[PDB]
Write a protein that binds this ligand. Structure first.
Ligand SMILES: *[C@@H]1O[C@H](CO)[C@@H](O[C@@H]2O[C@H](CO)[C@@H](O)[C@H](O)[C@H]2NC(C)=O)[C@H](O)[C@H]1NC(C)=O
Ligand code: KHP
Ligand code: KHP
Ligand code: KHP
Ligand code: NAG
Length: 481
């Protein structure tokens, strides 16, 4: 029995079932998600390897070889047609074409499920998915449940990393017009104990950590790499439950009446589905989604408990973010350009500007140090790396407005995330490509001999698809200094 079989047995069946990692019904053998690759802009689907099984990650790796991939569609396994696609503009514009939100990388969230590789949905600020034409989802004050398995360590405080029920117009239509899982450390509305992040419920114009606006002591900080968030709502009742998705049981952090503020009882749900964004298209949040569902009816605690036991049995474990030659902490390197016409250039810097320059044995010692990089444990991810200046110790290559700058580590989460890069076997086969940990659609990329965190196509000039594979491939050489 998969999660949706368990919900059905509790007479609260799934009406939307979304996962890039696995089938959520024991008999589902259809497509889990759609990929689009940058090389030819064509698509393919990824299905489970067996009915009721795990995503064919090998088929993704094959399709995405020597290029970049985006997850274009997360299919609804339930048969209701509630597929998640690129989220449209609403109250807020996204940063993509026509104010759409960005699609996620296919490769930002590698995992294993019982030892088998799969890929989650790693969502950087400005990423979002939606279905405003959803069928079967609860509306008005009708009962529903939902859950998601999320990365409890990938979050921020911006509005809003949500999964669940939202407005069909992509605008704020008032209190009670949403009911979605939220994960992050926003303290604009609700928050819990400790420093966050918190699972809360987005009910529109409020993230609730419980019955009260603001602080609720019973909502703990999440301390799990894989978190099961289970949320449910019915007629003047709702709940927040949380578990380590890798071990043990759901605990209940809120259960009872709707918050006693105008507009939350009865609810006015609209039945649209969102992922990674707020109901009005607020698109500042980040997070990672692995699997989740929405149901018809208010699930029992027992049904949710059987779902959690199923999740634990799936055995989520962190996967490898790194491929290709890679690095050791304390190694000093120079990174040589491989693009035809520029192959004598190395990644260097002039003060804060990271650039490419011709560097050779006759260059000034000043330039040799500027073309030399101390590789250290990733500031935001210990599998990945950060690139420390030899001439300016304590300063690292970071992205800022998607340009690579050499800036001093200020100890902030923002800097750490901006300064962390995951080596990948070079897209042209010549050395390494350095993928942004925080924006895995983007890579170290030279454009007019300046370094950017560029995507393979996009809204910035330096996201040009011309020479992309070459422009993101660098040979790892002995440091000049
Ligand atoms: C969410 O958690 C982050 C990470 O701890 C908090 O980050 C701090 O932001 C302040 C300014 O608001 C900086 O001066 C600190 O250096 C930050 N700390 C780190 C470690 O980056 C953030 O404040 C939290 N957000 C809210 C709303 O509480
Ligand atoms: O007035 N504002 O500054 C403002 C901006 C965004 C905003 O977002 C709404 O409130 C969030 C919390 O419920 C929901 O996800 C979103 O639709 C709610 C209020
Ligand atoms: O132009 N701005 O007002 C502006 C706002 C935010 C901003 O964020 C920076 O740009 C992001 C992308 O490189 C990094 O994650 C962050 O440090 C960079 C620039
Ligand atoms: O308008 N231009 O002057 C101009 C010239 C070259 C050019 O190519 C880019 O710059 C080259 C070197 O960084 C990269 O290989 C390529 O993406 C991009 C723009
Ligand atoms: C594709 O990338 C792999 C890994 O770097 C490499 O071995 C292979 O040579 C590349 N092929 C092409 C056509 O670039």
């Amino acid at each position: 029995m998969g999660p949706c079989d368990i919900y059905e047995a509790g007479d609260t069946p799934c009406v939307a079932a979304h996962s890039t990692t696995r089938a959520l019904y024991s008999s589902f053998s259809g497509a889990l998600y759609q990929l689009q690759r940058g090389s030819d802009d064509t698509t393919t689907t990824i299905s489970p390897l067996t009915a009721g099984g795990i995503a064919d990650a090998s088929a993704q790796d094959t399709f995405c070889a020597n290029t970049t991939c985006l997850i274009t569609i997360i299919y609804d396994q339930s048969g209701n047609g509630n597929h998640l696609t690129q989220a449209p503009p609403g109250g807020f514009d996204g940063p993509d074409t026509d104010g759409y939100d960005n699609l996620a990388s296919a490769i930002g969230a590698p995992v294993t499920l019982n030892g088998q590789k799969a890929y989650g949905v790693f969502m950087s600020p400005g990423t979002g998915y939606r279905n405003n034409e959803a069928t079967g989802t609860a509306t008005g004050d009708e009962a529903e449940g939902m859950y998601a398995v999320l990365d409890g360590t990938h979050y921020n405080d911006a509005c809003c990393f949500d999964y669940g029920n939202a407005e069909t117009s992509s605008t704020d239509t008032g209190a009670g017009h949403m009911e979605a899982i939220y994960l992050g450390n926003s303290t604009t509305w609700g928050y819990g104990a400790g420093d966050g992040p918190w699972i809360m419920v987005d009910m529109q114009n409020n993230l609730f950590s419980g019955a009260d606006e603001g602080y609720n002591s019973g909502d703990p900080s999440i301390s799990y790499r894989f978190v099961t968030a289970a949320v449910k709502g019915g007629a003047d009742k709702w709940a927040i439950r949380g578990a380590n998705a890798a071990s043990g049981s759901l605990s209940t952090y809120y259960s009872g009446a709707r918050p006693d503020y105008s507009g939350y009882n009865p609810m006015s749900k609209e039945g649209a589905i969102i992922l990674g964004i707020g109901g009005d298209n607020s698109n500042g949040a980040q997070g990672t989604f692995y699997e989740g569902v929405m149901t018809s009816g208010y699930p029992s605690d027992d049904t949710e408990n059987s779902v959690q036991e199923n999740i634990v049995a799936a055995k989520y474990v962190v996967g490898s973010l790194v491929s290709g030659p890679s690095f050791t902490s304390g190694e000093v390197v120079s990174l040589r350009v491989t693009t035809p016409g520029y192959t004598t250039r190395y990644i260097a810097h002039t003060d804060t500007t990271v650039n490419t320059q011709v560097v050779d044995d006759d260059s000034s010692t000043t330039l040799k140090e500027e073309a030399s990089w101390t590789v250290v444990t990733g500031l935001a991810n210990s599998q990945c790396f950060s690139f420390e200046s030899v001439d300016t110790p304590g300063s690292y290559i970071r992205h800022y407005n998607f340009e690579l700058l050499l800036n001093a580590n200020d100890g902030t989460k923002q800097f750490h995330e901006d300064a962390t890069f995951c080596p990948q076997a070079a897209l042209n086969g010549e050395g390494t490509s350095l993928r942004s940990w925080s924006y895995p659609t983007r890579y170290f990329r030279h454009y007019e001999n300046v370094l950017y965190a560029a995507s393979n196509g996009g809204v910035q000039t330096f996201d040009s698809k011309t020479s992309f594979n070459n422009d993101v491939s660098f040979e790892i050489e002995t440091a000049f200094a």
